[PDB]
């Protein structure tokens, strides 16, 4: 669920990190339309595509199991839709951490007028 996604982000990037992903680019947290603005936004777009492939469970509400092992996110003990959801989150949190250097604070809190309809597909 989102509670757990937030913990992955914070555990990977540092306390308060998750608040950076509430509304960023066209796809991080909020939004959901347009061409991803940069690599962090692309991580979020891929995460929505990942969530879009999940069937039978609700990605915001499903509680999976994960842990940190020597600072790395490890999904474990998950069956079916819980497995897939955890993996979506794990990969996205890792992708944010990989692309942290190019996070652009001017892409925070974009309005829909900055994210025009495009042909962006999963």
């Amino acid at each position: 669920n989102l509670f757990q996604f937030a913990k992955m982000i914070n555990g990977k990037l540092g306390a308060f990190s998750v608040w950076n992903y509430i509304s960023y680019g066209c796809y991080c947290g909020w939004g959901g339309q347009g061409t991803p603005k940069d690599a962090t936004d692309r991580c979020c777009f891929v995460h929505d595509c990942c969530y879009g492939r999940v069937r039978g469970c609700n990605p915001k509400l499903a509680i999976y199991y994960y842990s940190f092992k020597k600072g790395n996110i490890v999904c474990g003990k998950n069956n079916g839709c819980l497995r897939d959801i955890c993996e979506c989150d794990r990969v996205a949190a890792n992708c944010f951490h990989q692309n942290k250097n190019t996070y652009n604070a001017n892409y925070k809190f974009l309005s829909s007028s900055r994210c025009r309809q495009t042909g962006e597909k999963c």
């Binding site: 669920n1 989102l2 509670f3 996604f5 937030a6 913990k7 914070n10 998750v18 608040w19 509430i22 509304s23 796809y27 947290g29 909020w30 939004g31 959901g32 339309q33 929505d48 969530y51 879009g52 999940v54 069937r55 039978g56 469970c57 609700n58 990605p59 915001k60 509400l61 499903a62 509680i63 809190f109 309005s111 829909s112 994210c115 309809q117």
Partner: protein, 122 residues
């Protein structure tokens, strides 16, 4: 999509969703577990369950057709996925506006250090 849900929230509550409801309680913000803390949070839990019924529609990125005409929110799609996502958002924005007088800023950014009660069940 979430940009469109933000517009409905603005129209019914006067708030900008990315700075308020997006980080509120256990169900409006990044939670998805625990108890809904108040009426606002319970609106969001009902929306989360609503999204859960139309998971395959990919509610985050589903750009639907809606209009505000005469102060009302009207969903215009014939396409059942788009229409249902729009009705989920419409109902949530109506509910949020009905409960704006109990909106409590103590629940902004609250999810990460609370929300561990037995969770609501859709």
């Amino acid at each position: 999509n979430l940009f469109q849900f933000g517009d409905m929230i603005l129209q019914k509550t006067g708030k900008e969703a990315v700075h308020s409801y997006a980080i509120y309680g256990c169900y409006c913000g990044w939670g998805g577990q625990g108890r809904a803390q108040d009426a606002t949070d319970r609106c969001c839990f009902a929306q989360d369950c609503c999204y859960g019924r139309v998971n395959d529609c990919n509610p985050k990125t589903a750009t639907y057709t809606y209009s505000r005409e005469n102060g009302d929110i009207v969903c215009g799609d014939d396409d059942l996925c788009l229409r249902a996502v729009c009705e989920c958002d419409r109902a949530a924005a109506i509910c949020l506006g009905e409960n704006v007088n109990t909106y409590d800023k103590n629940y902004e950014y609250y999810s990460i250090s609370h929300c561990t009660e037995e969770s609501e069940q859709c």
